[PDB]
Structures are given as structure tokens and as C-alpha cells.
Amino acid sequence: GIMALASAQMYSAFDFNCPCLPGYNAAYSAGILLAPPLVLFLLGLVMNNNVSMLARAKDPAVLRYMFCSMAQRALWAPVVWVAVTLLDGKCFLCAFCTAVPVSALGLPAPELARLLARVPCPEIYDGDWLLAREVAVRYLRCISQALGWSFVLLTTLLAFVVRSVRPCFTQAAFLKSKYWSHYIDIERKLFDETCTEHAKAFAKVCIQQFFEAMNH
Amino acid sequence: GIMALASAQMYSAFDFNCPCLPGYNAAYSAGILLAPPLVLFLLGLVMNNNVSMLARAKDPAVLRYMFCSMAQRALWAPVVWVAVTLLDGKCFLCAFCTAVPVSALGLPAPELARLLARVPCPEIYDGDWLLAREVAVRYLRCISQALGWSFVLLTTLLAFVVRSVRPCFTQAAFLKSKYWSHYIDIERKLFDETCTEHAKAFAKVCIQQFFEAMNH
Amino acid sequence: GIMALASAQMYSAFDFNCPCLPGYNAAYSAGILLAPPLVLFLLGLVMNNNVSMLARAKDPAVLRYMFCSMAQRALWAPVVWVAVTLLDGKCFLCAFCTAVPVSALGLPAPELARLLARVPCPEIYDGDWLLAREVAVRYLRCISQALGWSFVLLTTLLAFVVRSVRPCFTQAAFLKSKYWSHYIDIERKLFDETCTEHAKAFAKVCIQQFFEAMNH
Amino acid sequence: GIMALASAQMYSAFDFNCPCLPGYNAAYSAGILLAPPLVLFLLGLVMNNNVSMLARAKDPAVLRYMFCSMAQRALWAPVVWVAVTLLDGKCFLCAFCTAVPVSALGLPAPELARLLARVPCPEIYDGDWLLAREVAVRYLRCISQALGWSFVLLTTLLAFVVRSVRPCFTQAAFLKSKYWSHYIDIERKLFDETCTEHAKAFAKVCIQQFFEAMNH
Amino acid sequence: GIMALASAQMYSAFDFNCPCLPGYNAAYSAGILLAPPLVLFLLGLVMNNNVSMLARAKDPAVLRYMFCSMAQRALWAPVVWVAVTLLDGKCFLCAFCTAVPVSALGLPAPELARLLARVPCPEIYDGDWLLAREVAVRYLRCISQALGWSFVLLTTLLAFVVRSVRPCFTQAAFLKSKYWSHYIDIERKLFDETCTEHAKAFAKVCIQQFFEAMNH
Amino acid sequence: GIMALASAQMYSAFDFNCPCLPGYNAAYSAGILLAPPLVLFLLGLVMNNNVSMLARAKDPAVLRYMFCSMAQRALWAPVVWVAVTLLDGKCFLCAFCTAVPVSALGLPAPELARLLARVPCPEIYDGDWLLAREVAVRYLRCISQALGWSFVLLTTLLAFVVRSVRPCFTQAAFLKSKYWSHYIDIERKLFDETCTEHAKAFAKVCIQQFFEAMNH
Amino acid sequence: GIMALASAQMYSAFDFNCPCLPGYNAAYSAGILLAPPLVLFLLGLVMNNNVSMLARAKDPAVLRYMFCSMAQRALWAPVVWVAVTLLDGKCFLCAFCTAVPVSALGLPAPELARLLARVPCPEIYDGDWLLAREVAVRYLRCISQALGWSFVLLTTLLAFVVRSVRPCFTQAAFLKSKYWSHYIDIERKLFDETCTEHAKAFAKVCIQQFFEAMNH
Amino acid sequence: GIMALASAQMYSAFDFNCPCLPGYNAAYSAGILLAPPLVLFLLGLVMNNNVSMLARAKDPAVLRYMFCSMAQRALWAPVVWVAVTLLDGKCFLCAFCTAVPVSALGLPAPELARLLARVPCPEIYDGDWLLAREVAVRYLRCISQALGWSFVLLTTLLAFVVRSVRPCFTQAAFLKSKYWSHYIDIERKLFDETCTEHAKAFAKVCIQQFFEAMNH
Ligand SMILES: CCCCCCCC/C=C\CCCCCCCC(=O)O[C@@H](COC(=O)CCCCCCCCCCCCCCC)COP(=O)([O-])OCC[N+](C)(C)C
Ligand SMILES: CCCCCCCC/C=C\CCCCCCCC(=O)O[C@@H](COC(=O)CCCCCCCCCCCCCCC)COP(=O)([O-])OCC[N+](C)(C)C
Ligand SMILES: CCCCCCCC/C=C\CCCCCCCC(=O)O[C@@H](COC(=O)CCCCCCCCCCCCCCC)COP(=O)([O-])OCC[N+](C)(C)C
Ligand SMILES: CCCCCCCC/C=C\CCCCCCCC(=O)O[C@@H](COC(=O)CCCCCCCCCCCCCCC)COP(=O)([O-])OCC[N+](C)(C)C
Ligand SMILES: CCCCCCCC/C=C\CCCCCCCC(=O)O[C@@H](COC(=O)CCCCCCCCCCCCCCC)COP(=O)([O-])OCC[N+](C)(C)C
Ligand SMILES: CCCCCCCC/C=C\CCCCCCCC(=O)O[C@@H](COC(=O)CCCCCCCCCCCCCCC)COP(=O)([O-])OCC[N+](C)(C)C
């Protein structure tokens, strides 16, 4: 929920500017596509109250179920982030602009990969001959949205299969897991109210021992 | 409700830009009309709490009714998305711009399909002779809205027929289905409160066994 | 209420653009005036909880009353939509622009019906001689608002007559109808609470039969 | 309340454009001043729950009082609409622009009534000689606001007189009217709860007769 | 409260345009200063629930007190309206612009009163010689704000005196008035609940007499 | 509270325009600094429920205390208004612009006091020689803010002294005052409920005497 | 809280304009940095309900503790105001602009201190030779933010030390202080309810003595 | 929470302007990156209610645990501030602009470090030869975002490790700590209600001793 809402609204606040240099284009875009997905995965494992308990008095089946159910909810931000990035076209445009068919709809090996690398940067682009900048753009942003929809499809067709076979699920392990998660909470609330009554008997003997001073 | 509201507000956030190339126009528009409808269908089956139970101790009539009633609610986003796409004209304009009567209200086979393909792109369009760009536009966007209203009509005239004959419906199967859906919930709430009382008797023996340490 | 509010706010979101062609003008405007009214009528019959029950153990008088009262509420969107369309003038301007007195306040049969057809389109209009475009506009939008007020009047003078004679109404049939509509609801709420008690006696025997496994 | 709020906010949404033609000016303005007041009167009679009951077992004095009190609340929109229309000046400007003193603060009978008729239309007005357009405007909009304030005065000085003499009022008829309006409501609420208990005894015999099927 | 809030927010919605003609200036401004104050006075008498009761079984002292206390609350809009009108300067500028010292800080009797009358109208003003238009303005709007503050002072110094002597007040008449205003309300609430019990005994005999029809 | 909030938000709604004339500058600014403070003082005395009771059965000490505590709360708007007026600089700029050192940072006695008087009016100022208009401004608005801060200081250093000595205060008179203010309220609430029970015994005899008419 | 929120939002409403004169620059900025801090200190002492009680029956230790705890909360606005003023740079720019190294990154003693003094005033600055105005600005606003951060650091490193040693604190004096602050409140609420019962016995004898008049 | 929200919204209110001078660039940026993180750390220790209690009757293990858990929550603002500063590029651009490869994608040692230092300042930059200013920018802002993501990764991969080994944690010390934190609160609430009852017995003897004065 909030994790998935902070994944799409964290994309618009982060500015994508790319170097438009013939070697840094691909390296910069590969890392601004893979790293923040990997950060939203670890930030979903860290922030549920079972990461330490799995880190023995519990059956191996109950651990395997309680682990695989832990990861599957961490995969909602890593998937919503990669989809909004491919449906935008900025990351795909910078990484692949240097390899575009200039003969169809359109100098050594250098002087051309250095000219084509400035396509995503409108104020730097000089070579408006050999290619209109809006013809190379608007063609790489369509190949990017064909992949952004093939990813949402194959990913939704896979979350459907893991609700019909339900691997790593047995009713014996699903029941034993739901019981132990209840024992955790009740033992907590019982401990607190036993701490606020064994202390309240020492409070009354401390106050009247300190009400000895300010009464004379 | 929310599924249908996320279907119309997901259309304005997604930008439709099309390639304006004489072969990619039709392929790009066919997929930006069919794929996200197919994604909103699977995303409605996956997110109701009966997809696994249907995946035997239950009568075949009760399964067939509980299945056909499951799909019919998944068809509200796929229909609202295809209707708003045809009532906008952008998808129809790009896919059919290459085949427009240039003699009425108006070079080899090439040099013409490549000139006509840039009609939806105002900054790329060169051939302002042989056709005004706002005369070819404003004529394809009217054929698109005649189909967008013929689709809302024939689709509303079909949701009316399936409320008067009510196929795959019998009162015997409608009653048996509503009963089993109640047994699911009551067995759930009875299980939990039996788990928070069989554990609460072991809590009191654990706390005083751990209140053995911090009292001496 | 909501149906009537979704009828006026659905008019501003839908863009009226017309072809300004000498044959498509009238056909396009006739269908963008008649079809969405017909869609809001069927969408009011479909969405009340009596369309199937009327589709025999009930008196014929009670059916006729319960039918005619069903349609009269479906007529609030079809009337509010046709009124806002005539009080705007866009639909009337495109359908009748080709037949306007050019002699009063102002070439074969063609070259004139093709010149006059571009009046509603300001960027396409060439023939600024023989007619100022704002003189032909501002004269068709006044004939359109005389009809838009004659329609709201004759329609409000008819909803007044069907509250003073009240056809298809008898106190015998109005009373029998209000009773059967109460029997529908009470039989529903009685069925549910009988389903959550006959099942709750089988739940207790299932849980302790499944509390046999995770206790040893 | 709401009727009076929908009367002033319905004036700003409706656009006043007038033909600026030497014969349609007066006819168009006479109807855009008289018709929507007449529509707000019938729309206040239709929408109170006594229009049918007055359409005999009741004294003639009680009917006359209950009728005259019915109309007086329907007169709050027809008066607020005519006042906001005269305090704006647009309707008065178009209907009387053709008859303005051009000698004071300033061609056959035609060529002058056709020149003066375009005063309310700034883009059509040609005859900027013989009259400045803002001198003929700003003089007809002051005669319009002297009448708009003489109407609010004489109308408020009349609602004051019909609260001090109180015609068609007698304490005998005011008391008999307030009693019959209470008998209407109590007989309604008594009928419903007698319909949900005579039916609830047939529900229990229908459910267990339909709980005969899904129990074996 | 609301009357005083509708008095200041009704001033900004009403547009002050004045004729800038040498005879209509003073007449137009005298009436747009005196009439709407007189309308807000009668609209405060009409809308309190004692205007008819004063229009005999009650002592003359109790009537005189209950009348003079009735007017004093009607004087809050007539005073807030005249103050905001003088603190704005538009009404004072148009009525007195024709009589301004043109020798200090600066043609027959006509040709001068007709030139000076267009000072409040910036687009009509021709005589920018003999006077700068912003020098005649900005001098009449300062004499207008010296009077607008002398009016708020002498009016607040008078509402202070009528809270220290308190004319037309005696404790005998203030007590008799507060008692009769309580007898009005209690006799109302006692009448209603006596009307909903004498009718409820006839309802039960009507329903079972009409439950005679729809039971056989 | 509200009085102090209506004192600062009443300053921005009132427009300060000054005459820029060599004699009206000082008189206009002296009155737009002193009068509205004097109006907010009398408007705080008038609007507390003790102004009449002080206008004898009460000790002289109790009156003197209840008077001096009455004024001190009326001094919060007169002080917040004079401070915001000096911290703005407009009033100080117009009243003293005619006497500014034109030799330092820079014609008879006239022709100079009439040239300097137009400094606060940017569109009227002619003498841009002998002085830049933004050099005479920006120097009078700094002397105005040195006085606006010396006033807030000496006024806050005086509200601190009258909370440490507390003149016109004795605990005998503070206690007698708080008691009489309680007797006022309790005698009020006791009077009302004695008026709604001595009248309720006459209501029952009036209703059944008027239920004599509409029952036969 | 509110005092600290009114300290930062009172800075943006007050306009900093400085004279840009070679002697008034430093004096104006020294007072617009020191005075409003001193006003927010006295305005925090005045507005807590202990300033008079400290102005004897109470131990000297309890007074010293209750005084030093009184000042420490008055220091939150004086510190937040001086920090936001140094982190803005306007006050530092005007006071030190006259002494800036014009040789590094760049006429008698006069003609130079009078040229440099107009740096903070962009419309007055003439000497754009010998110095770019944005080079002298942007260098004084960096020395101002190095001091604004050294002040927030040394001030936060001092509020940390006075929470670890806690001077003027003893548990005997902290306990005696918290008790006397409770006796103040309980003696207040006990006094009031004793004033509304000794008066309520005289009310009943006054009302029936005044119900003697309006009953005959 | 609020500390972390005041860390990111305090970054946009503080303006980063840098000197663009060849020696102040690095010193200014090193301090606007390190100091406010150090201020948000001390401002998190100071504002929790245990900083004094740790400044002996408590076991050493319980102190070490209660200290290390105190710091870890103070590290959420210092980490969110350093991350948003590196993901923006302004601090990295000014500190390293003087050392940029001008040969790749592009005078003594001086005249070059003084030319390159003005890159972050667009209005001061002169040397648009030898380097385009948007080519040196857009290359330093990409090296800055590779470090801003390597910091969020290595910092999130470290908060994951300290939730799986959990150093400085033992269940004996975690239990003893949670108990003492409960004894603190209960001894507080017990002290107050013992102070409002030992005082309430002296109040009744003071009031009637002061009700001796104002009763005679
Ligand atoms: C506010 C929202 C913003 C608006 C929307 C914005 C538009 C977004 C548009 C569309 C988004 C729609 C996508 C939905 C997909 C379902 C999510 C999912 O997968 O989890 C499912 C797992 O199922 C899987 O195992 C599939 C995961 C495949 C691995 C992908 C790795 C991701 C990193 C890519 C690396 C490759 C890099 C290479 C890239 C070329 C969970 O299964 P479940 O049945 O739900 O059970 C859990 C129940 N629960 C849910 C209750 C916990
Ligand atoms: C916030 C909203 C946004 C604002 C509005 C925006 C404007 C939108 C304007 C107008 C939209 C109005 C349309 C309403 C239609 C009814 C929906 C429906 O069909 O479901 C009905 C099924 O009935 C059917 O079976 C018909 C479906 C036909 C198959 C269509 C496939 C869709 C993919 C096309 C592929 C072809 C591609 C080729 C294209 C050329 C459900 O029947 P029911 O009786 O309701 O029973 C269920 C009860 N329930 C509802 C309680 C569950
Ligand atoms: C948020 C709102 C937006 C703001 C306002 C926007 C401005 C709108 C301005 C003005 C709108 C005001 C109009 C009000 C009219 C009343 C409605 C009505 O008719 O129903 C009445 C039926 O009465 C009839 O039978 C008359 C219908 C005539 C047939 C018209 C067909 C419509 C399609 C035209 C095809 C022709 C095409 C050719 C065109 C040239 C109902 O009667 P009732 O007594 O009420 O009883 C029901 C009780 N109930 C109401 C409780 C259920
Ligand atoms: C949100 C508001 C918008 C803001 C304001 C906008 C600015 C508006 C400014 C100002 C408006 C102020 C006007 C107020 C007048 C009172 C209303 C009234 O008349 O009803 C009174 C009737 O009294 C009458 O009988 C007088 C009616 C005269 C007939 C007029 C016909 C109207 C059509 C003209 C055709 C002529 C065409 C020719 C034109 C040249 C009711 O009397 P009552 O004592 O109240 O008793 C009822 C009690 N009740 C009220 C509880 C039910
Ligand atoms: C929403 C707000 C807007 C935002 C802020 C805007 C920025 C404003 C900035 C700053 C304003 C801060 C000023 C605060 C001063 C305290 C007020 C005061 O004085 O009352 C104190 C009286 O104390 C006195 O007696 C001093 C009054 C001196 C006389 C001044 C006359 C005023 C007219 C000038 C004529 C000279 C003309 C010549 C001019 C050259 C009250 O004392 P107390 O101890 O409080 O006891 C009462 C308790 N009580 C408060 C509960 C009732
Ligand atoms: C509204 C928000 C704004 C929107 C977002 C904006 C975008 C932000 C994007 C991304 C931010 C995501 C980062 C999250 C990291 C976790 C925080 C953390 O570290 O604390 C963890 C400690 O764990 C550690 O010990 C690691 C700290 C390393 C030391 C860093 C020093 C910081 C100063 C750098 C100096 C170097 C300078 C040199 C620089 C080159 C806490 O561990 P825990 O397991 O949680 O246990 C505590 C439980 N608790 C949490 C309940 C208390």
C-alpha cells in the first residue's frame, strides 16, 4: 500500500538527467533501473516484524511458509517501479540512442556515436542533419512502451498462477503459522500489565517516603 | 468501483505518442488497445477471495454459478477502457491515417504512405499540400466517435438482456452458494478466538517463569 | 440524483468536434443527440433492483403500476442531457449551417454547400466574403436557445400534469405494491441469520477436529 | 433555499449572446426574461408533497389556505431571477439598443436601425462614427440598474405588507391545516411497521420450506 | 451576523459603473447609496418572528420595548453598507467630479461640465489638458475617506450612548417581555405532540380497515 | 482575539492612497492613524456585558477594579493597529515627504514643496532631477520602521510592568468581583426555567380550549 | 510551539529594505537583528501564569528553580529568529557591504563608501565597473551562512549540556514546586463552585420577589 | 517520523548558493554537507525523555542496551539529509567544478581555476569557449547520483544486518529495560493524584477563611 504509493511518487521527485556521452549513457541507465528496485526489496524485508524471528523449536515447514510469504509482499514496489520506468521512455532513450538506424528514417565510427549520444539532450544536439531529433525520439519511446506492456502482462499472468497452484502451501503449515503469530501478541499484552502492577506496589512506598520531606 | 475508477484515470496518466511510421502505426495502436484491457481482466480475477477455491465436495451447479458471477464483475474495467479509448480518437487516428481519401477533401505507393503517416505528428508533417492536416484530422476523429457510441450502446443493450433472462442462474444454486460463503467467514472468526485462549494459558506460565529472572 | 449529475458532467468531458463536411454534418449531429440519451435510459432500468422480478403469482394491476413507476425515474437523465445540448448551440450549429440565409445579413449548388459547411470550424473557414463567420454564428445559436427553452417548458408543464391526474395509479395497487416490496427485504435478512447459525454448529466440530493436528 | 441558490447560479452558467439583428433583438430578450421565471414557478409547485392532495372531505377554508401558502414559496426563484437579470444590463442592452438618442451624446430608417443593432456585439460593430460604443453602452446599463433597484424595492415593500395583514389567514384554518399535516405522517409510519410484521410471519415458513432443499 | 455578512459581500458582486454624463451622475449615485440601505432595513423587519404579533391584551409598555428592540438589529446592514460605500470612493467620485477646482492643481459653462463628467471613465476622458485624470481622482477619493471615517466614528459614538442610558428600557417591561416570548414557544411544542396522539388513535382504525383489502 | 485579528486584516482591505498635495498630505495621514484606533477602543467597551452595569449597592473598590480591567482588553486592537501602520511606511512617507534633505543624497519655497509632495505617487512625480524617487523612498521607510520597533518595545516593556506591580488590584476586591459575576449568571438561568413552567400550566388550558373547535 | 511558529512566520511578513546609505546601513541592521529578539523574550515572560507570583512564605530554593525554568522556554523564539535572519543573508549584506575586498574579485575615501553602499539595492547601484553586483553579493551571503550554521551548532551543543548536568535542579525543589502548582488549581475550582451555591440561595428569593410584579 | 519529515522539507527552504570562487567552493560545500547532519543528531538525543537518566542502582547491561537503542533512532534524519543532498547534485557541482576534464568533451594554473569556478553560476560564467556550461554540468550531476544511490544501498544493506544479528541485545536486558520504563510512568501518575488530595483538604479551610470577608 504505502510502500507501493511511495514507489511511484518517488519516481517523479527524482530527476532523470542523463550524461549524453558515448560511454556513460548505458552505464548510467542500467544503474538507475536496477538499484532502486533492489533498495525497495530490502526496505520491505527490514520493515515487517518477523525478519529477526527467522534469523530450533519450530518445524521446518512452518519456517519455509513464513519466509516465502514474507518476500511476496516485498515484490510490489520493485515491480511497480520497473513498470513506470519503462512506460516513460527516458531510461530506454538514453541507453540505446547511440545504436539507432539512421539510414531508415534519417563520418568514422567516432564523430557519429558522439553525435548520436546527444539525442536525449535537446540543447546540446548539433547534428540536426542526418536525423531529425523528434524522429529518433518518438521511435525509441515506442519500443520502450511495447516492453513496458509486455512486462506488466507477463508479470500479471504470473501472479495469477501463484494463486491457483499456491506452491509452498499446505493447510497444516498455514494453520500452525497463524497460531504462533497469535501467541506472540498475547504474550506481549500479558507481560505489560504484569509490569504495571508489580511496580505499582513499590510506587506507593516510594511516594510516602518522599512525601516525608515536603510535609514538615 | 475503484477498479473502474483506476481504469479511466490510468488512461490520462499514460501518454499516447505514436511513431508516425508507415508500418509501426497499426501495430503500435493494436497493442495499446488490446493489452491493458486484458491486464485489467486478470487483475480482477486475481483480487477476489475465490480464485483459489475454484482451482470434489461441492456440487457442479454451485461451481458453475460461482464462476460465471466471478467474471462478470471483471468486465467493468475492460469495457470502460475500450470506450474511453474510442471516444478520444488518438488510437484510431494513428492506425488508419495512412489510408484516407485524399481525392475527396484534398507520387508512387511510397512517398505517399510515408507522407500520410505523419498526420498525427504536427511537428513532423511536411506535406501540407495535397491535404490540410486539420482536414484529415477532424474526419478520422468523427468515424472514431461513431464507433465509440455504437460500442457503448451494443454493450449496454447486452447487460440489459443478462438481467432479464439471467442465464446460468437457478434459485437452488443461488441459495446453496450464499450459504457456503457464510460458512467460510464463521469458521474463520471461530478459529481465531480459539487460538487466543489456548495460547493465553501458556503465556501466564511463561511470564512468571521469566519474571523469575528480573526479580532477584 | 447521481444519474442526473453524471448526465451533465459527462457532457463537458466529451468533446464535440464536428466534421464540417457537406454530408457528414447532419448525420454526425443527429447521432450525438439521440444515442447517449438512449444509453442513459437503459442504464437506469438496468440499475434498479426490480428489472428481473418483472421479467403469475402477482396481480396484473400491481405489475403495471410497478412498471410505469420504474420508467419515470429513468427519464431524468435523458431530459437533462437533451436540454443542455440545445442550450449550448454546438450541435444545432453544425447540422444546419449548410442551410442559412446568405442574402439576409450576408457559385453553383456545390462550391457553396462546401463553403458554408466550414462555418463551425474557424481555422478551416475560407469564405469570409459573402458572410462574416460571427454573423452566421450568433444567429444559429439563438434559434437553438429558443428551442432549448421551449423544450424545458413543455417538459416541465408535462411533469406537472402527471402529478395532478396521476394515471396508472389506484390506492389499492399502490398499497399492494408497497407491501410486497417490504416482504422482499425481510425475507432476505431472515435468510442470512439462519445461515450463520446452522453453519456455526458445524464450525465447532471442524476446528477441534483440526485442532487435533497442531496440538501434538 | 436550494431553489433560490439554483436560480442565481443557473444564470452564470447560461450564456447570454444576442443576435444583434434589428428584429430578433427584442423577441430574443423578451423570452430570455420571462420563460425561465415561469419554469422555476412550476418547478416549485411540482416538488412539494401537496400538489396531488389539492388536485370533498376537507373544509373549503382549509384548502384555500393550504393553496395560497403553497404558491408564496414558489415565488422566491422567479423574483431572484428577474432581479439579477435587470441588475446585469445585458438583456436591457440588446432589446433597447436600436432606440437610443444618437443626437444627445453622439441615413434612412434602415442603415441606422441595422447599424445600432450591433452595439452589444463589439466585434461586429462598424459604425464607430456617430456614436462611441462605450457611450451607448454605460448609458443603457444605468437605466437598467435604476429599474433593477425599483423592482427589489417594490417587491420587498410588498412582502412586508403580506406579513402584517396576512390575507387568507384565520387561526381556525391555520390550526385545522397543521393537524391534518400531522395525520398524514403518522398514518404513514404506522402502515410500514404493520407491513414488516405481517410479512415476517410468512418469511419463517418460506425459509424452512426452502431450507428443505439444501440440507439433504 | 449573516445579514451583515451579506451586506458587505453583496457590494463587491454589484458593479458600480456610472454614466459619466453631466446630469445623470448625481441622480445615479444618490440612488445607489440610499436604496439598498432601505432594502436591507425592511429585509430585517420582515425576517424576525414578531412582525405580525405587533401588527389589546398586552400592556403598552411591553409593545414599545419589543418594537424599539426590533429595529436596532435591522440597523447593522444599513450602517455597514453606507460605510463601505464611502470608504471606496467610487460613488463620491462620480457625483462630485463635475464640480472640482480646476484652477488649483490643474470654454463656456457647457463644454466644461461635459468634459469634467468623464473623469471617472478612463476610456472616455478626452480633456487630459487642463487636468491630469489621476490628479482629479486621488483628490476626490480622499475627501470621500474623510467622510467615511467621520461616519464610522459618530455612529460608534452613538451605539455607545444607547448602552449607558438605555432609553425605552425599564426592568418591569424587560421582564414581562422575556416571559411572553417563552409562552409562545411552549404553547407551540405542546400543541404538536397533542396533534400526533389524537391522530394516532384514528390511524390504527384506518390501517386495519385498509388491511381488509390486500389480505384476501 | 477576534478583535485583534479583525484589526490587522482590516488594514489590508482598506486602501491607503494619499493626495500628494502640499497641504493635504499631513492632515490626511494624521487622521488615518488616529481615528480607527479610537474606533476599535469604543468598539471593545460597547461589546462586553458590563458597560451598562457600571453606568449604589456595590462597594467603590469593586467598581474601580471592574472598570480598569475592562479597558485593558480594549487596548489590544488600538496597539496592534498603530504598530502595523508604522511598520509599513506608507503613512510616514506621505506626511513627511515634503520635508526631506534634498542636499544630502540629492526654485522658491513653492515649486519645491509642490514637487516634493508627489514622491509617494509614482505616476505623478515629475521632478526626477534633484532627487531619485527611490532614494527619497527607502529613506523615509527606514525612519518609519525604527519608530515602529521602538513602539512595540516600549509598549511590551509596559505590559510587563503592569503584571508585576498590578495596580488597582487587591485580593479583597478581586474576590468580591468574581462572586458578583457569578450571581449574575445563576439568577439568569433560574429565571428562565421558572418562566417555562408557570406558562406551561396555562398552555394545557389554552390548547384543549382551542381543541374544542377542530374536533366537532 | 505557537510562539516559535509566530517567530518564523513573522519574519516573512516583515519586509527588510535597507537604506543603502554609507552610515545608516550598519545602524539599521543592528537594530533589526537585536530588537525583535528582545521583544519575543519579554512576550514569553508576560504570557505565562507565574510572572506575578514571583514578583516570603515560599522557600528560596523553590523560587530559584521556578524562575530559571521560566526563562528557558522564553528562549525558543529569540533563538529561532536570530538563526533564520543569519541564514537569509539580507541583514549581513547591508551592514557589511561597505567593507568588501574590491581588489580580490573586482577615488577618495568618499565616492567609494558611497558607491559600495548601494550594492544591496539593485536599481540604485551605479558602479557596475570595479565590481559586478552579483560577485559582491553571493560572497557576503556565504559568510553569512557560515555564521548561521555555527550559531545553530553552538546553540544546540549548549541545550544538550543543560540536559545532562541540569543546573539549578534538586529533586527536593522539583517536588516542592510541582506540589504548589497543584494547590493553585484546586483552590481555584473549589472557590467557584462555592460561589455558585451561596448565590443560588439568594436567587430564588429575588425571582419570586420579582415574580410578584408580572403576575397581577 | 516528524524528525525525518522536517529533515527533507528543511532542505528545500534553505537556499544553496555557492560562492563560485576558486578556494571557497570546497570549504563552503564541505560544511553545508556535514554540519546540519550533526545538528539533527544532537537534536534527537536532546528530545527523548532518557538523556538525563543515563547521565549506580542499575545494571551495566541495562544501561548499554538503553543507550545504543537511543542513538539508532537519531540516525534517521542524518541519513535522509545526506542522501537528498547527493541526489540533487548542487553540493557536488560546486566543490568539484574546478577539477574537471576539459580536454575530454571540451592559460596558466590561474586564469583557468578561476574560469572553471564560475560553472555553477550561470550569470557569472564567461568562458563559454573551451567548455559548454551544460556539458560540464550534466556530467558532474551524474557522478553525484551514482554516489547518492551507492549510499542509500550500502546504508540499507546495513540496517538489514542489524536486524538479524541484533548486537548489544540480550533477552534478559531487553526485559529488565521494558520494566523500568513502566515504573517511571506509574510513579508519576501516582504522585500527582496524591498531590491533588493532600492539597484539597487545605483548600476548604482557606476558602471559608476567605469567605469570612466578603459575607459581612
Ligand atoms: C498506487 C499504485 C501506483 C499506480 C499504478 C502505476 C502503474 C503500474 C502498472 C502495472 C503494475 C501491475 C503489476 C502487478 C504484478 C503483481 C505484483 C507481484 O508480482 O506480486 C505477486 C508475486 O507474483 C510474482 O511472483 C511475479 C513477480 C515476478 C518477478 C519480478 C521481479 C521484479 C524486479 C524486476 C527485475 C527485472 C529487471 C529487468 C526489466 C526489463 C504477489 O502474489 P499474490 O497472489 O498477490 O500473493 C500475495 C498476496 N498479497 C498481495 C496480499 C501480499
Ligand atoms: C468512474 C467511471 C468512469 C466514468 C465513465 C466513463 C465513460 C464510460 C462510458 C460508457 C460505459 C458504459 C458501458 C456499460 C456496460 C456494462 C458493463 C458490462 O458489460 O458488465 C455486464 C456484463 O454484460 C456483458 O456481458 C457485456 C460485455 C460484452 C463483452 C465486452 C468485452 C470487453 C472487451 C472488449 C474487446 C473488444 C475489442 C474490440 C473493440 C472494437 C455485467 O452485467 P450485470 O447485469 O451488471 O451483472 C453484474 C452485477 N454487478 C454489476 C453488480 C457486478
Ligand atoms: C444536477 C442537475 C444539472 C443542473 C441542471 C441543468 C439544466 C437543466 C435544465 C432544465 C431541466 C428541467 C426539466 C425537468 C423535466 C422533468 C423530468 C421528467 O420529465 O420526469 C417526469 C416525467 O414526466 C414526463 O413524462 C415528461 C417527459 C417527456 C418525454 C421526454 C423524452 C426525453 C428524450 C427526448 C427525446 C426527444 C428528442 C428531440 C429533441 C428535439 C417524472 O415525473 P414526476 O412527477 O417527477 O414523478 C416521478 C417522481 N420522482 C421524480 C421522484 C421519480
Ligand atoms: C442565495 C440567494 C442569491 C443572492 C441574492 C441575489 C440578489 C437578489 C436581490 C434582491 C432580491 C430580494 C427580493 C425579495 C422579495 C421577497 C420574495 C417574495 O416576493 O415572496 C413573498 C411574497 O411576496 C409577494 O407576493 C411579492 C411578489 C410580487 C410578484 C412578483 C412576480 C415575480 C415574477 C416577475 C414578473 C414580472 C416581469 C416584469 C419585470 C420588469 C413571500 O412572502 P413571505 O412574507 O416571506 O411569506 C412566506 C414565508 N416564507 C418565505 C417562509 C415562505
Ligand atoms: C493576530 C495578531 C496579528 C499579528 C501580529 C501583528 C504584529 C504586531 C506586533 C507587535 C504588537 C505587540 C504589542 C503588545 C503590547 C501589549 C498590549 C497592551 O498594551 O495591553 C496591555 C496593557 O498594557 C498597557 O497599558 C500598554 C498600552 C500603552 C498605551 C498605548 C495606547 C495605544 C494607542 C496609541 C496612541 C499613540 C499614537 C502615537 C503613535 C506614534 C494589557 O496588559 P495585560 O498584562 O496583558 O493584562 C490584561 C490581560 N489580558 C491580556 C488577558 C486581557
Ligand atoms: C518523509 C521521508 C522523506 C522521503 C524520503 C526521501 C528519500 C530518502 C531515500 C533513501 C533513504 C533510505 C535510507 C534508509 C537507511 C536506514 C536508516 C538507518 O540507518 O537507521 C538504522 C541504523 O542502521 C545503521 O546503523 C546504518 C547507519 C550508517 C551510518 C550513517 C551515518 C549518517 C551520517 C553520514 C556521514 C557520512 C558523510 C559522508 C557522505 C559521503 C536503524 O536500524 P533499525 O533496524 O531500523 O532499528 C531501529 C528501529 N527503529 C527504526 C524503529 C528505530
Author numbering:
A (entry chain H), B (entry chain G), C (entry chain F), D (entry chain E), E (entry chain D), F (entry chain B), ...: 25 to 79, 89 to 139, 147 to 256
Publication text:
Calcium homeostasis modulator 1 (CALHM1) is a voltage-dependent channel involved in neuromodulation and gustatory signaling. CALHM1 is the recently identified member of a large-pore channel that permeates ions, including Ca2+, Na+, K+, and Cl−, and small molecules, such as ATP, in a voltage-dependent manner. Furthermore, the ATP efflux through the CALHM1 channel in type II gustatory cells and the subsequent purinergic signaling has been shown to facilitate the perception of sweet, bitter, and umami taste sensations. Our studies here showed that the human and chicken CALHM1s have a conserved structural fold, oligomeric assembly pattern, and a phospholipid-filled hydrophobic pocket for controlling channel functions.
